[PDB]
Symmetry: C2
């Protein structure tokens, strides 16, 4: 299927990406992980997102998430994600064509015991996909939790 006009500005995402990241948060000792992301489409104004992580040393599976990115030609975007840990997120924000960036903040986090808000920011940097995930809790204000860089395969 052809790329939908609403998806075309984000066509740089389409494909599979692999790299590594680092997590750290108050009370959570720093850790590293491997990550793979696939962005795909079926001609609708939606990009399917699938992600998995693993332990570096072994490749042992860790977590997974999946969802859908819905860009619109005014530069707005909404993203819905379900996580293997049992959370859901509704993310809203904007994309910037000049910067090849996507900036999202949660409108909703569902089924979480502690997390209150999640922000997600993507940026293409020299053709690599970077992101920062920031998290808040009732007692910890929004702050970095995960960051990764992935190469396009």
């Amino acid at each position: 299927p052809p790329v939908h006009p609403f998806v075309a500005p984000l066509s740089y995402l389409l494909g599979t990406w692999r790299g590594q990241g680092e997590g750290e948060y108050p009370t959570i000792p720093s850790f590293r992980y491997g990550e793979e992301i696939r962005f795909s489409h079926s001609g609708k104004p939606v990009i399917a997102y699938t992600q998995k992580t693993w332990k570096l040393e072994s490749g042992a599976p860790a977590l997974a998430e999946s969802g859908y990115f819905r860009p619109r030609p005014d530069g707005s975007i909404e993203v819905v994600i379900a996580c293997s840990t049992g959370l859901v997120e509704v993310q809203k924000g904007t994309y910037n064509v000049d910067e090849q960036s996507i900036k999202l903040k949660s409108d909703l986090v569902g089924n979480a015991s502690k997390v209150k808000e999640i922000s997600r920011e993507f940026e293409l940097v020299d053709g690599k996909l970077s992101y920062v995930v920031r998290l808040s809790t009732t007692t910890n204000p929004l702050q970095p939790a995960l960051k990764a860089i992935l190469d396009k395969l």
Copy 2:
């Protein structure tokens, strides 16, 4: 990876399924669709769920959803789903080993303009996967909306 002990009671789901369904709802004329579901795992206490639908005549893509099923040995289960239309759901309920059934009701529906609650019920019937999805809105009480039967591939 081996099947996790918490997943084993639902191992009958694992694989790919294809069939067809029918939708109908107040103000929504009846329609039919094709459907494919895959259930998979990576050795964690989680089953990954991916689904797509299409038009019967042509096979043209329609919608998609994906998420995660988290069964527990007391017979409880939670399910998180993200939909290509831009919704999320947190579903909670129970599974029954004798009946090979799973009965879920939403604790949360996110980003919906009209839907308030969603219930999902699966049943293995002569080795085929059946479900009923029921939906409510502010003015329409919970009632059937989608039903499908799928053969295991």
